[PDB]
Design a protein around this ligand. Sequence first.
Ligand SMILES: O=N[O-]
Ligand SMILES: O=N[O-]
Ligand SMILES: O=N[O-]
Ligand SMILES: O=N[O-]
Ligand SMILES: O=N[O-]
Ligand SMILES: O=N[O-]
Ligand SMILES: [Cu+2]
Ligand SMILES: [Cu+2]
Ligand SMILES: [Cu+2]
Ligand SMILES: [Cu+2]
Ligand SMILES: [Cu+2]
Ligand SMILES: [Cu+2]
Ligand SMILES: [Cu+2]
Ligand SMILES: [Cu+2]
Ligand SMILES: [Cu+2]
Lengths: 298, 298, 298
Amino acid sequence: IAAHKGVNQAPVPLKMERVGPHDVHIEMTAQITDIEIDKGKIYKAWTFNGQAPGPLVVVNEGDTIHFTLKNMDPVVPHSMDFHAVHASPSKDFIDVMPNKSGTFTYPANKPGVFMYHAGTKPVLQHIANGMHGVIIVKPKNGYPTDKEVDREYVLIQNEWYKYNDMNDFQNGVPSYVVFSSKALKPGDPNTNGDTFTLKEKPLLAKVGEKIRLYINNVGPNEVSSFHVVGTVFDDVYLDGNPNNHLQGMQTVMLPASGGAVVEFTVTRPGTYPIVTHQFNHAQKGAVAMLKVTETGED
Amino acid sequence: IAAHKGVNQAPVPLKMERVGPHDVHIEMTAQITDIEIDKGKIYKAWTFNGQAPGPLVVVNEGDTIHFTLKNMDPVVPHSMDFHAVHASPSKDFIDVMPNKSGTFTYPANKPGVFMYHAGTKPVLQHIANGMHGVIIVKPKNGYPTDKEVDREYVLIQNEWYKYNDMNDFQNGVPSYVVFSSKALKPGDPNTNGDTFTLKEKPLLAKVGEKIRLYINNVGPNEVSSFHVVGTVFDDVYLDGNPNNHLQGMQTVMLPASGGAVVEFTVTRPGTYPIVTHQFNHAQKGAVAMLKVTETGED
Amino acid sequence: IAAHKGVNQAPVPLKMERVGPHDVHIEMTAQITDIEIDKGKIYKAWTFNGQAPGPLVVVNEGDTIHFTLKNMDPVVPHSMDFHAVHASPSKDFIDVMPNKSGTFTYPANKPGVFMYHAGTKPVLQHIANGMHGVIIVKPKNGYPTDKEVDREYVLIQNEWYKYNDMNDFQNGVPSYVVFSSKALKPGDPNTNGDTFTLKEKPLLAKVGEKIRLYINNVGPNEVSSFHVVGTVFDDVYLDGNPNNHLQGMQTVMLPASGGAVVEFTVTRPGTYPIVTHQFNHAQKGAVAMLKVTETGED
Ligand SMILES: O=N[O-]
Ligand SMILES: O=N[O-]
Ligand SMILES: O=N[O-]
Ligand SMILES: O=N[O-]
Ligand SMILES: O=N[O-]
Ligand SMILES: O=N[O-]
Ligand SMILES: [Cu+2]
Ligand SMILES: [Cu+2]
Ligand SMILES: [Cu+2]
Ligand SMILES: [Cu+2]
Ligand SMILES: [Cu+2]
Ligand SMILES: [Cu+2]
Ligand SMILES: [Cu+2]
Ligand SMILES: [Cu+2]
Ligand SMILES: [Cu+2]
């Protein structure tokens, strides 16, 4: 895109603040940012806030979100669709033009781990170019296993294709399939979807801990067969809804846009790969590492 | 197929009648019919009754079906396999030759949303050419959420490939992935699997309604990540069996031939896309529209 | 691989023995063996014990497995990952070098139908070349439907690609998708993943029986839409965990590495195909036959 040539906008922090007991303001940007998706390979991504996937949003069940999108792209319109909310797509997920802003208000009344993405036609183009992320809606009454959990992380799976190639997006195999992690607190890792970061800088844990991961497969096109090597999921909650509760799974099937909360134990020290078990995708990048030490540091 | 050149058989209505409290007669045809699957693109489909997917069949749990197939194809044999029934495939799903008829009897003793299709080798060829559909078996005791439901529709997802090309069927990506809707009553829309009808003529609803969709992904080859934009499914029943009950899902994973009953609320007026969230397939046709008005008309 | 040219190692029996009430010794080989995967087509497979998929392992919930792998491959290292166990992947799933042995100890504390495979980088290469199988962990308290079951079989789905072709493994469609069956007792069939054996030599049953199948889709890359023609699954237990219980399904979605216990009735005599309903894969080999007779023999 000629107007994107030499555009590289620096990442903007997510702006959030609570304005009432069940009302929250969120402000995000649409912006064009270069991300290194594999060693030596830059993708000029269409992003929220200069991250792909975008920043993590965490709200509580029953919050109303008053959301503002500032479009920094000089030519392409962008929009936001949150899977968490009930809204009118043709009134509330509409396009925000270049250098313009839009504000929208809608409720999050279901707990879970939800995809968000741009809703601008062709949606495939916006998702594939990087406009995806996750919003977590915390359940009012928690999960039944909350007392047993020691440590929490967020992981997101996405694909990358040949740059802005609609034929490849529609008809091709992914070039790369990747994990990223987003921070539930400062001090947690917060990364972009790339083939290497979570191998070189693993997630940490301590021997004996019960780990909770909040996971979402944003696609755009593939399903995921999510598995942690060396363990079995003790509990699974499909889409993060506490009522959707499975036990003792080896692997969790996730549709495109599907989420889960998964919990498992790590019993021995060592390095534990995290994969999609569709091993063509794992080979193309989708392996993250969990390093489990006798202290929880390293 | 040389004997199909210039054959275009007009659609025949489904013939059904109840002959006892738990016995029902159904008569269907196998016939060759041109269907416009995308603007300007005719597919000479192998069909039941001149529709692809075929006509909707609705029976009650515990009905015995006395089914007749009349084969109008002048050269190719066809057969019927209903997923709803218990039967002997080699005695009851057998081929009916050209210009011949066959009658078969079998029970439907499980509730749900079931695929039907031809069982004639190679089955892939018959399904891909259009010989698929859905049979709904109503549960004797209903669903637990029946009192909350305001409006019901049936949607079916299928793929189309290059015309009668067994290499493409086996090894290729779909050319088109489409939705259709079938009528649960006269006045409901009843359409074929095409890229456009349910965009140009949306399904209707009224603000505030709880909507039930009975859905099946007939394939032949792909899985589906079924999602309604702007809402969250309040309740899901896998394969339409009332015992298989999930809540608060964003997206429902359907195998090839898999079904579901899904229920959701629409809270604001506007146009609500209905997608598979495998967005390469949505881009290739699989977007239907739900128009929600302040009165339920337009 | 030049050191594999003319290597064809004969199949070795699985060596197992119980050494305490909750301790079991298993000894397996890694070996190179020619298997006929389709008529006229030999694949020089990388195998456990000269079978692909490997031999069935059955243990009880809470058993500790003391596992030895003898690597008979003259050049390539191999390793074992059992999905059933809790272990440290970097200490317990490590490579065993050529002509060397390794012993590892880990517990199986969850019931179900679990994949096993090599863990040697690149894992995709080892799985695709044939290093996969299933371990069944029996539940201490059985399944709730155990009294109703008449007959049990194990079926495994896998893919084959162009021989040892990493480009094809990562980017290509499968050449063949196949079922095999493994014996739960001597007298049961025990076969390799090929396009023909379970068509030419069907599984047997008797009219009226409730059949239990323990199934796993080992991949490496595809999902499975598992279906028995002519029946409906009465009960399904996802991953073989008795708590994960669905009823009345037509088709079961399995991720890559996913398992299930499924149970169904066969009401009439005849031949009942067993398929993945992703019919491109069924066309490429994944159809097995169940022959149901008035006596249970033939
Ligand atoms: O309360 N609206 O930003
Ligand atoms: O065992 N997981 O690759
Ligand atoms: O009762 N048979 O058509
Ligand atoms: O939010 N659905 O595309
Ligand atoms: O008890 N170890 O083989
Ligand atoms: O009805 N199964 O192909
Ligand atoms: Cu406000
Ligand atoms: Cu965008
Ligand atoms: Cu979406
Ligand atoms: Cu009759
Ligand atoms: Cu046909
Ligand atoms: Cu079928
Ligand atoms: Cu020992
Ligand atoms: Cu190996
Ligand atoms: Cu594995």
